[PDB]
């Protein structure tokens, strides 16, 4: 039963804390937590390749893509491993994240600890935007906040 945590911080008001739990190895991962400071609506929520922030969230790299696939949605088969879809910030800018994903893992080759979790500016179009940016970043906009996913107690 592995557990992980990640603290989203950026150069803007957006700040959050997200927890990950995998009670069984190679099984579904529960991702729950809270983000604040967001604009009301949908926001991109992804896991990028590198846990690197020497130059901020931009140092995280692209969406964690170990299988060299196109960008899609959490339920799509054509997706990056880090494609977790969108989170919803309510009228108070609080996103109470609750997600369950079975492609990301806390171990193995799809393992995401030591990688960066990022919440974005715009909304992920799930790879259906009709441009080359849609099949890569989902037109989710700039990187609002990010954090290294580390082992938690």
């Amino acid at each position: 039963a592995t557990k992980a945590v990640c603290v989203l911080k950026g150069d803007g008001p957006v700040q959050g804390i997200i927890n990950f739990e995998q009670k069984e190895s190679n099984g579904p991962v529960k991702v729950w937590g809270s983000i604040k400071g967001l604009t009301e609506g949908l926001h991109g929520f992804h896991v990028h390749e590198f846990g690197d922030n020497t130059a901020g969230c931009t140092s995280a790299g692209p969406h964690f893509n170990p299988l060299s696939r196109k960008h899609g949605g959490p339920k799509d088969e054509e997706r990056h491993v880090g494609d977790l879809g969108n989170v919803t910030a309510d009228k108070d800018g609080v996103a109470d994240v609750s997600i369950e994903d079975s492609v990301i893992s806390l171990s193995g080759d799809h393992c995401i600890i030591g990688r960066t979790l990022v919440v974005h500016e715009k909304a992920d179009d799930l790879g259906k935007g009709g441009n080359e940016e849609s099949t890569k970043t989902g037109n989710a906009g700039s990187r609002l906040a990010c954090g290294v996913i580390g082992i938690a107690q």
Partner: nanobody
Amino acid sequence: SQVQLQESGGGSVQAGGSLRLACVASGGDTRPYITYWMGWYRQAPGKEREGVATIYTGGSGTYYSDSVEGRFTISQDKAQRTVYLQMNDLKPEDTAMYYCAAGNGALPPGRRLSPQNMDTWGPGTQVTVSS
């Protein structure tokens, strides 16, 4: 460079009347994802800073104090970056210098209408009521 606030619309009024308190923000961080919790406040003669209402510039959340009820109504035009604090059904203990202010958009609940967690303040206009 600094988020300057400027209030207006305040003055003298009688008990049981309306008085619009509008404040236009200027300067600072004008990127669209910057969010504040814009709150109107109250320094009564001899008291400390109170706090009447607050709104979110990144959504539509409105939080009020208990001293006020269905008497005030706070709204916003985001394009004009202006917050409107309607003030109808006024009583004589509302006499105070009403300032508006802006705090962090991720300010947790409760601390939203706290004057200590507030960043920048406005000059202020006095809203006196007569009975």
